[PDB]
Amino acid sequence: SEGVLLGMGNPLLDISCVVDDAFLEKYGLTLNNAILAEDKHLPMYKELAANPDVEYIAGGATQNTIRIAQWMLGESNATSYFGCVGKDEYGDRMFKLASEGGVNIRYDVDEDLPTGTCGVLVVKGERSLVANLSAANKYKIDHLKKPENWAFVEKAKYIYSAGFFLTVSPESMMTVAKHAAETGKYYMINLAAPFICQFFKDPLMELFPYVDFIFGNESEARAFAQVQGWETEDTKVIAVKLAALPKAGGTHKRVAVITQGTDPTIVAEDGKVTEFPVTPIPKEKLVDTNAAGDSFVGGFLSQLVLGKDIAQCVRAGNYAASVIIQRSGCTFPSKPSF
Ligand SMILES: Nc1ncnc2c1ncn2[C@@H]1O[C@H](COP(=O)(O)OP(=O)(O)O)[C@@H](O)[C@H]1O
Ligand SMILES: Nc1ncnc2c1ncn2[C@@H]1O[C@H](CO)[C@@H](O)[C@H]1O
Ligand code: NA
């Protein structure tokens, strides 16, 4: 099933460090939040580089999801990934790691900007993200439309992008979403962060009629609900309302999947809510929750591309996230035991 799943996003190198409450207060950051880097965050990246516990791990939300799906599938080149990197060592490092894991990496390159990075600040297992997109922000629709890269869109039956890609190339997302609508394929996104639901609500709502599977966490679902004027904080209601939003075509229903950390995963399908409890990981065994949501999607998608039911997809998602939260960032052993 070569290239059955394609992802498109921002390939970033995670600069991860266990810090404390004072470091977040210093740079005005919030736990369980993601922002785009500002000039005031350049001293932060310098401080992270000098910290003795700093770790450099391949990141990027879509890339994490695709690498996890590939690990769960276990058949080389079942997945593909598009994204933009710089002509530097960080770009080649992520290329080599993901390719060796079995992902068919098709990176676009920027001539002048360095490869994108993300500050991952860990406090008692929880994380705060500060993305410096750099070359990831320069993804070109020209790369997507080149025959050798368009062939992997044609080969794919499932296409996924984290909502973070709406800040970079909403035109590339629309192009592949419209292709999927014309061919009976599945187009899927995540809400990614509250800032995406608030500041990128308009490109998000232009694409939403073409979304067959919408993924998100409870804070994103609540941020989306507040933005749309839905006077509710109930994630069960928000999940049903997300599935019920208009669709460009009736070929597929829209399934909404809302994760809630240690609380049950919510699925809205055909107007009914099903909840799937999480088996919590001991606080002792917990390293960090960075890439937990991305790995839940990766696990869910690995079963979805094999034709499994939605309950088996959620079970595989909870499994993949449980494995990843017992490691730093999006890191995993070489072979699964699902
Ligand atoms: N402490 C935990 N123990 C066990 N599983 C967890 C824990 N935290 C997260 N998970 C798993 O990771 C998934 C995603 O967590 P969540 O915090 O909702 O994601 P995100 O990274 O998008 O914030 C959960 O649905 C669950 O399966
Ligand atoms: N703006 C962004 N675009 C893409 N990936 C991002 C962004 N912000 C954070 N991430 C990624 O989110 C992951 C955790 O979900 C991290 O590995 C980090 O690299
Ligand atoms: Na992404």
Residue numbers in the entry: 3 to 340
Would you copy out the relevant sentences from the publication that reported this structure?
Adenosine undergoes ATP-dependent phosphorylation catalyzed by adenosine kinase (ADK). We discovered that maize and moss enzymes can form dimers upon increasing protein concentration, setting them apart from the monomeric human and protozoal ADKs. Structural and kinetic analyses revealed a catalytically inactive unique dimer.
The asymmetric unit contains one monomer for the ZmADK3–AP5A complex and two monomers for the PpADK1–Ado–ADP complex, all in the closed conformation.
